[PDB]
RNA sequence: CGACUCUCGGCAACGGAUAUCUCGGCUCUCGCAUCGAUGAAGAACGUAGCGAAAUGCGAUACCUGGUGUGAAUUGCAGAAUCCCGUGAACCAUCGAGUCUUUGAACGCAAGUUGCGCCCGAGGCCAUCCGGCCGAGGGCACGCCUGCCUGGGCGUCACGC
RNA sequence: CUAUCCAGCGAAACCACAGCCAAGGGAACGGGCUUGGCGGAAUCAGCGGGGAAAGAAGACCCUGUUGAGCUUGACUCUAGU
RNA sequence: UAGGAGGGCGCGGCGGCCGAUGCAAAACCCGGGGCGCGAGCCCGGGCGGAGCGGCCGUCGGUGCAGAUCUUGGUGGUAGUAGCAAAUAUUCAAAUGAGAACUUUGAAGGCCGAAGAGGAGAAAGGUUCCAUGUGAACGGCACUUGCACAUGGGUAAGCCGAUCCUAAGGGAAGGGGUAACCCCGGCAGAUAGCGCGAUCACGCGCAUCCCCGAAAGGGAAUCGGGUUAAGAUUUCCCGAGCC
RNA sequence: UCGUUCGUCUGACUUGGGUAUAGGGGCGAAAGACUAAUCGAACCAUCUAGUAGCUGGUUCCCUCCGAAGUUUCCCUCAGGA
RNA sequence: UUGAAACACGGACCAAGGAGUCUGACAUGCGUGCGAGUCGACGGGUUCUGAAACCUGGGAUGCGCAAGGAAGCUGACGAGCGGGAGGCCCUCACGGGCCGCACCGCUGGCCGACCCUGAUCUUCUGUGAAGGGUUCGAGUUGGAGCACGCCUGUCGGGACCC
RNA sequence: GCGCGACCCCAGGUCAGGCGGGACUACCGCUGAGUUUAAGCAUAUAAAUAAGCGGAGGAGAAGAAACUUACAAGGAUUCCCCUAGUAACGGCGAGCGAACCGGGAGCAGCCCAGCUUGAGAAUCGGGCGGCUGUGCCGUCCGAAUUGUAGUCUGGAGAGGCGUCCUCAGCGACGGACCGGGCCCAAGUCCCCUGGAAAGGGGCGCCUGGGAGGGUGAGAGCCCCGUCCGGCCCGGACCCUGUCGCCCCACGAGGCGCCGUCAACGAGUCGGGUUGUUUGGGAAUGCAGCCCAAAUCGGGCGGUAGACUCCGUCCAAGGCUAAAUACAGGCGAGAGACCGAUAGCGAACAAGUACCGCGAGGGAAAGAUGAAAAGGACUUUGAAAAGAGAGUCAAAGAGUGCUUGAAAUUGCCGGGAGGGAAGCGGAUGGGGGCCGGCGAUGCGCCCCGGC
């Protein structure tokens, strides 16, 4: 965010003071002098045309807040985990009935590429082309004040293409794709893998960066990982099929 | 997308840059695009638009209508093409304007200065085809 | 039945809310350091073919010169060679120019266009080869370094 | 000369909603409640009983752990001398 | 009731999802039909002519009947109170679409000269004069005007200011002050030097700067003409004066 | 402010202009009078959105639970723990 | 307000604006991450839409893990009872037995203040086998906390508005 | 009846120069309140602030220990984090409150006065002249011996010695940062609605360009741009990159040996007392007054004091980037911000009209339409205007004109009224209104084809 609030000075460029009681009319600050409609006029109200407004916004509001290195690394794995779900990927929104298996890796010859041409031939292959038609389909002006905050256009998400081999070109050839995203897969972002804070991000994984995958994020093992104090959460159910718990042979 | 940081993408600062251009800024916002013929000739996509230069109308009510151009009127961003007239309620005739974009330049006055515009319009979009 | 009073419904008023906007504001962040005795900020008066204000500018006065761009300005009227170019433009930009009265403001003042002194391009006649009208330009205060003219038995020497 | 009527013109204070009363009850003096009296459109000019009429967040009184002017033998200081 | 908690309705954004939209969006109106115990919601009709919703998450300048609340508008009041001091108006005519209000003439009265007359100082600023005028203003009215528009107008050797000083003010040197500022007789090679003289030099230097009066002091002007508006003496003719 | 009626009117008289004194200061034939409709301490801006145990207001629905004016202490009784 | 229709105050009418917010410290309740640790908050590297994101350091930064004393200083030598959820055994079962978390109550030990005490050993004022205490601690014999978020409350901030 | 030199001091419209004022964000110095809190209030707090008076720069101030520490010690300045709401301080009440350590950002040290040319002012300035012009050179005058220059600054240093080791400039072409300009992909292809196609439908294309804006409605492709960069011009440059010619010394420095020297800042420190200030407490700073130094010496080690020992530094002179700040100035970029009673007081000829003697106070006011295409003309009218007419998609969008609410008013139609009206619960009578307001289908069965 950026902070936002009122000039300090506001409702305050004006010496008022009161008329106090005696004069038919409210106690409340009046400015002072004639020749102006501005005179007897309220001043430094909330109440009043012209005044403040009640507890005027400050810039040192908690714009940002904090939330535990490992509370964000446990958010991202259960963002990883549950894109490898077609059913929650689809859940989400994206049009997933062409994609040929889950959850969806590309050789790495795909990083060679130049042209945003040649990426929509990529995406012809697998299953994914439809889904940026969508994006560019659904694309249209943001509708309330946002049309003219320089917020116009908004659209839908498409696939989030993840590389591993840095310092390649398909970073800028899918840039210019509406809904489609490239991220590195070192440093995969939240706000890629789960926008709205709703799960499945669908997303296209190149072979170089789902081969390092288990290299970056580790095991249920100490010191597996590339990031310092960390293992994989662990859930609560080894196993959530309650299907087999409330009908397995022991139970019943 | 953007990636020049010292180019504004707002839209009051881009309205404010658009609506109070001098006249050598309109001069290069009053552009419109040549014919195919033209364009084959020259191989440009567009230019700006002259005193004497014979245009075409393409979107207005007065498609297909041609003319040279006989006032390009900075200050309303209008033009007013030969004979592209209405009549007023007392019958006098005035022109009405045309916007830059929606016109085409059917001929075109190529004065010298003029020719070495579009040979350096022309060679640059040339460097970028080969 | 009719008038009045209350009222319901349709239209018309009164009025400027609501909705859609926005060359504006606010906030955050960033880059540079650039006023003045070589006359500044501010103030005043002028200045356009038809302007009062705002915006410019200073008797060269909505500008001059350069350079770039490359055909307009424009509410109207008018000169327009201003057109394959020493070249339009309420154009951009900045080096060449001008910059009235003021103002720290500086000759003395100031409800004063008040009152002085000095220099002087030019010209007249000759009371001489001098005087008069001059265009312009000067005259503040405290100070620094140097120079000129001086004062004091302050300390002296050398002398009448 | 007004006031009255007429042509021209044309405000403001005030206004919860309004405006007939007797007795009772009630925040112990009702236009509205209860019980009775009665009660007939619309208007004109007054008048001064009522509207505990308007004007003014009572000045009298008290509370304030609010002030201010002034005094002194209040408390603490200070110019001066 | 005070008070507490839970579930919901509504407003404006942000991240996502689902869409509506010139075959008519938003907004607003209705004696329209419904849904909900309720906040509210859905649909129809109309005007309207360009954008808008619903859901999950999330946030905030979010819900009005009061505050002698702020601003704006509008009522009754109300065609009502009222337009009343300064004696006074009337008749023909004319212009004009229209006359109590303009203009002319006859009349009748008032100011009655310490005036409701003729000039100025201050202050105002073009109100002065002409031509015209749809509005507004002239608390009625208007052909009218001190209103509106377009033009015009203010002439000095003699009238003033300018010059001098008064009450009194500002100040250079000096003294104070943290600095702005404050003190002027404190006496300092005093601010200024002056006068004869240059074909140069001599003499004196007192009590020593500037400001301060359109009523105090004061170089000098009178008469007759004249313009729509200037002048008595500013212009013109004559006659003077410093 | 207006009308009739009144005080004084050669005087410590009436008055124009210039000038002096500017706020806890000025000026006062003395009334706390006057110092620009403001004076028992002017006006203006700022600290300042001063403080208030005091008065007034404190904006949507349903559901469910739902009291206290009592003890003790406080310069404490219009308040608070 | 004990009592309003009040002869108690505000209110002519409409439209829009209009009043518990934001911040620092703390607290309980709840959610989430990890858990004797937890925080990456000041910095650095990276970041091709990014003031975002991601990585890094801490071997001692804060809080916690140890308290008592005013200070010198000393610093936890290992828990039993009553009742109890639930599990297990016996019985045909009724009924009984055993293990018995949390929690409540009870009685003690250990560390420190204060007092008391003195075998031994030593650098002669130190140690402290034994034994203590109608006293005291915000202790111990239970590791439970760190971080973020939210509601209510408190306090300071203009601080619900005038 | 003299000529003089110096010292002090004059007047100079003398030659050449430097100073005043302005803006307020941030920075430096002085001055300096009170409302408030303390539930009163008087110290305290508000606050070492607001106001007042001054001074600068682009940052300023500070800055190389007369420092902290008690450690195994560290090593200039500044800012961030923690230290720490802690030690402290305080009617020990309300309250107030830093520092060393450590972690980071950035890092840089220097130069004078003194004893030290005396065979010799070796220094500096001004005038004049010459050139290679921010200077350098020749000459004259002058300043200066009451000391300019040179060496030295405590880490040292001065000397003597030593094999030894280290020293100069100028070109050239660039690179880097700064400003400015020029250019740069792709449909305006066919059908419909429409005033307009930017909308729907079909067929295509660009994309390192789907940021944004314009254009007659939701425009990637009509226009400007945006991505990639390309080309030219001009600045400052003094940072460094590579090439060439010129070759660095008896002078300076370093390193080592020596032992003899070894100078270090005065009404200054320090002390008393007083006021203020502080967290600073038998006194943290600062200031006045009085006292008033030292050279086997001086200041500190957070309790006043004497002594013994210890650790530590050397004041009273000066300069110094970076790290930091930034409601002002110029140039920029974004925003979970306001959308005309909001946001600055001001989106507009806003600090404007207007008010006050004056200090000062200080508004209201945005939108026709795509294009003015702004209503020709006829008729009534004194004219304003009306009724036709015309413009446009529309005027009923008609120059304060997008949409056009409510209170309030007029006409039209209806309803009712014996000193209120309104409201709630019953239905009754009037209206207005609802066809998802209310149905016509199901099985068996016979064809006749499907
Ligand atoms: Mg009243
Ligand atoms: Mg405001
Ligand atoms: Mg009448
Ligand atoms: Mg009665
Ligand atoms: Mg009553
Ligand atoms: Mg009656
Ligand atoms: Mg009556
Ligand atoms: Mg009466
Ligand atoms: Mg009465
Ligand atoms: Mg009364
Ligand atoms: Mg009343
Ligand atoms: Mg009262
Ligand atoms: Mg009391
Ligand atoms: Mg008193
Ligand atoms: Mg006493
Ligand atoms: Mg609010
Ligand atoms: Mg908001
Ligand atoms: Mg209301
Ligand atoms: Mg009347
Ligand atoms: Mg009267
Ligand atoms: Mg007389
Ligand atoms: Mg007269
Ligand atoms: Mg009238
Ligand atoms: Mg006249
Ligand atoms: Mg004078
Ligand atoms: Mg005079
Ligand atoms: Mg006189
Ligand atoms: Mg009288
Ligand atoms: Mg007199
Ligand atoms: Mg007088
Ligand atoms: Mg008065
Ligand atoms: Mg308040
Ligand atoms: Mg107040
Ligand atoms: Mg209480
Ligand atoms: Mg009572
Ligand atoms: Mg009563
Ligand atoms: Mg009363
Ligand atoms: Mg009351
Ligand atoms: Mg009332
Ligand atoms: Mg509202
Ligand atoms: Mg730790
Ligand atoms: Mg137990
Ligand atoms: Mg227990
Ligand atoms: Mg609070
Ligand atoms: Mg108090
Ligand atoms: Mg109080
Ligand atoms: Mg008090
Ligand atoms: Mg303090
Ligand atoms: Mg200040
Ligand atoms: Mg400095
Ligand atoms: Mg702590
Ligand atoms: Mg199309
Ligand atoms: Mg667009
Ligand atoms: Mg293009
Ligand atoms: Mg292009
Ligand atoms: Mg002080
Ligand atoms: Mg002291
Ligand atoms: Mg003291
Ligand atoms: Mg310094
Ligand atoms: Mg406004
Ligand atoms: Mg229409
Ligand atoms: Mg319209
Ligand atoms: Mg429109
Ligand atoms: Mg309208
Ligand atoms: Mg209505
Ligand atoms: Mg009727
Ligand atoms: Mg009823
Ligand atoms: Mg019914």
Redesign the interface.
């Given at each position: 965010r950026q902070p936002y609030a009122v000039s300090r000075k506001a409702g305050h460029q004006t010496s008022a003071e009161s008329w106090g009681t005696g004069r038919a009319v409210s106690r409340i600050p009046r400015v002072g002098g004639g020749g102006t409609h501005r005179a007897g006029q309220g001043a430094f109200g909330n109440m009043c045309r012209g005044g403040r407004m009640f507890a005027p916004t400050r810039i040192w509001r908690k714009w940002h807040r904090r939330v535990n290195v490992r509370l964000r690394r446990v958010a991202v794995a259960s963002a990883l985990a549950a894109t490898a779900v077609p059913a929650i990927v689809t859940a989400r929104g994206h049009r997933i009935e062409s994609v040929p298996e889950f959850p969806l890796v590309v050789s790495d010859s795909a990083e060679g590429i130049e042209k945003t041409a040649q990426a929509i031939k990529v995406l012809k292959q697998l299953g994914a082309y439809a889904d940026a038609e969508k994006a560019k389909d659904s694309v249209g002006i943001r509708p309330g004040k946002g049309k003219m905050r320089n917020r116009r256009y908004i659209n839908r998400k498409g696939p989030l293409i993840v590389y591993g081999t840095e310092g390649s070109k398909i970073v800028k050839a899918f840039r210019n794709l509406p809904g489609v995203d490239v991220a590195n897969v070192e440093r995969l972002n939240l706000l890629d893998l789960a926008p709205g804070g709703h799960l499945g991000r669908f997303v296209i994984w190149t072979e170089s960066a789902f081969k390092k995958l288990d290299e970056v994020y580790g095991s249920f093992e100490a010191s597996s990982s590339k990031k310092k104090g960390f293992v994989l959460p662990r859930p609560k159910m080894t196993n959530a099929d309650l299907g087999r718990l409330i009908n397995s042979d022991e139970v019943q | 997308?953007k990636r020049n940081p010292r180019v504004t993408?707002?839209?009051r600062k881009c309205r404010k840059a658009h609506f109070t251009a001098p006249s050598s800024v309109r001069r290069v916002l009053m552009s419109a695009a040549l014919s195919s013929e033209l364009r084959h000739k020259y191989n440009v996509r567009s230019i700006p638009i002259r005193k004497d230069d014979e245009v075409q109308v393409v979107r207005g009510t007065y498609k297909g209508r041609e003319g040279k151009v006989v006032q390009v009127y900075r200050r309303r961003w209008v033009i007013h093409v030969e004979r592209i007239t209405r009549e007023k309620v007392n019958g006098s005739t005035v022109n009405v304007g045309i916007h830059p974009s929606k016109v085409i330049v059917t001929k075109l006055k190529l004065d010298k200065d003029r020719k070495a515009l579009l040979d350096r319009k022309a060679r640059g979009r040339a460097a970028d085809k080969a």
């Open positions: - | 997308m993408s707002s839209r």
